[PDB]
Structure 1
Amino acid sequence: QVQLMESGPELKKPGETVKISCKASGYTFTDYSMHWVKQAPGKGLKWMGWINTGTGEPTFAADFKGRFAFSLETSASTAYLQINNLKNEDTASYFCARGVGLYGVDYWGQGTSVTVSSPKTTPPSVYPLAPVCGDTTGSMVTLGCLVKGYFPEPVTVTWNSGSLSSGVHTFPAVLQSDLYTLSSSVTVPSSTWPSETVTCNVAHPASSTKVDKKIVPR
């Protein structure tokens, strides 16, 4: 099977240099243009360029010219995008793509997301978010977990060890001052809270911090 396999997602800092691998598999490396495509975290596919697999000769889009090094290891059939002078714009998911050429790119690297930024690994502030009079919706008391100020992602936010799946909506962690806050919300019936404990169990493998906060009535 032809499979484009790449390096792993990598946290980086501004000014650094990243080289994302792409290893060819299941096909003759030489014969197909190896391509690179930038998917910015919010943006769609923005094609970075292609390095000629026969010659090892890179070709860059006017954008990607000059900051980025396409390189091809031949024997082991690995392709590389090396980004130099890492920038917070260089934070993005990056894809090597095997050219079927004038038919474009058939397959794709499994994906490699660079995160270029300064911050240091930080534990979350996990806040049990209790409902008030209006926050009790029908029989259900919606409950919440404010997971606040951690770098990097992810945190693993479960609810009573994940025993609450359904009413849970764990909402996306986003950047705050290069730290992450997610406010996760379980919807539990007022019959089960605070009669049954609702404890949002928040594990942050990067900071190695597992923080468990029971939501208690205000």
Structure 2
Amino acid sequence: QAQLQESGAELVRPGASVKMSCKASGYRFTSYNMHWVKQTPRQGLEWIGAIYPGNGDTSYNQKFKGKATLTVDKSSSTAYMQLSSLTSEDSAVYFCARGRLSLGFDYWGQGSTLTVSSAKTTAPSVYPLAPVCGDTTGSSVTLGCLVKGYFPEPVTLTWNSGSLSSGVHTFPAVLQSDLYTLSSSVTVTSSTWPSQSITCNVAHPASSTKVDKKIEPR
């Protein structure tokens, strides 16, 4: 019955300061400590601090002292975490969780993703990937699509409007120098390409763009 409702994703540039929320319901908010955790592929799960909504007292992990501030609103059973002087290092996912003295963190919010970039909305450049000299050794061939230089996420990619769903690999996007770049390959029978046209359809909602890139033999 307990439920932790976290605020949505956030996108800000360095030097900025955001304030995430965690609305609690289904129990007596002032009876349990609210904890906050940071998650990143490089650092993993990191405890940030805890607040006792009852009186407002807080404990902080030395590592985030000065970086994070925890508060609460007793009347609206809401907890808050503000992060200042944001840098690309603060880019991660943040969770709030109910702390039980002896049972650990029995409940966790969905988490709020924080992306810190100095970049502004940017449509991707869709680049066709054709096999060297249009060759192929097996009874099958592999084509690809390079979606680079876009912000922010996400991006939608299909092959031939989804008709080709088998044999495809759309790799996770990678952030580099403020922008994202994703990759996608598709494998079909030799008798399919160049014989029949293979097209990469890429959509980027944040910038309202739709691009259809046909893979031509060169």
Q: Note whether the superposition's TM-score is higher than 0.5.
A: yes
In structure 2, distance between residues paired with 1:25 and 1:208: 37
**1:196 maps to what in 2?**
196
Q: Deviations over 1:53-90 (max 9, x none)?
A: 21122211111112211111112211111111222111
1:78 paired to 2:78? yes
Q: Which one-letter code corresponds to 1:185 in the other structure? A: S
Q: Residues 139, 160 of structure 1: CA spacing in aligned structure 2 closer, same or farther, 3 A cutoff?
A: same
- Aligned residue type for 2:57: E
Name the count of aligned residue pairs: 218
- Which amino acid letter does the alignment assign opposite residue 22 of structure 1? C
* Percent of aligned pairs sharing the same letter: 72
List alignment gaps of at least 5 residues for structure 1.
Answer: none
- Check the 8 A contact 2:134/2:217 in 1, yes or no: no
- The answer on 1:206 being equivalent to 2:206 is yes
Q: Alpha-carbon deviations, 1:109-164, whole Å to 9, x = none?
A: 11101111201111111011112368625222111001011111211111111222
Question: Which sits farther off after the overlay, 158-167 or 109-118?
Answer: 158-167
What is the SS of the residue equivalent to 1:24?
Answer: strand
Provide closer, same or farther for how the CA distance between residues 49 and 4 of structure 1 changes in structure 2, counting only shifts above 3 A.
same
Residues 76-107 of structure 1: per-residue CA shift (max 9 Å, x gap)? 21111111122211111000011113432111
Q: How does 1:25-64 map to 2 (within 5 A)?
A: 25-64=25-64
Does the CA contact (< 8 Å) of 1:52 and 1:59 recur in 2?
Answer: no
Structure 1 residues 205 and 80: CA distance shift in structure 2, 3 A: same
Q: Distance in 1 between matches of 2:75 and 2:189?
A: 61
Residue by residue over 1:14-48, the C-alpha shift from the partner in whole angstroms, topping out at 9 and shown as x without a partner, is 11111111111211111111000011243311111
Which residue is 2:147 aligned to?
A: 147
2-structure distance, mates of 1:69, 1:125: 40
TM-score of the superposed pair, with normalisation by structure 2: 0.94
Match in the other structure for 1:181: 181
2:119 corresponds to which letter in structure 1? P
Flag the structure with higher helix content: 2
Partner of 1:161, secondary structure, is helix
Deviates more, 1:14-23 or 1:54-63: 54-63
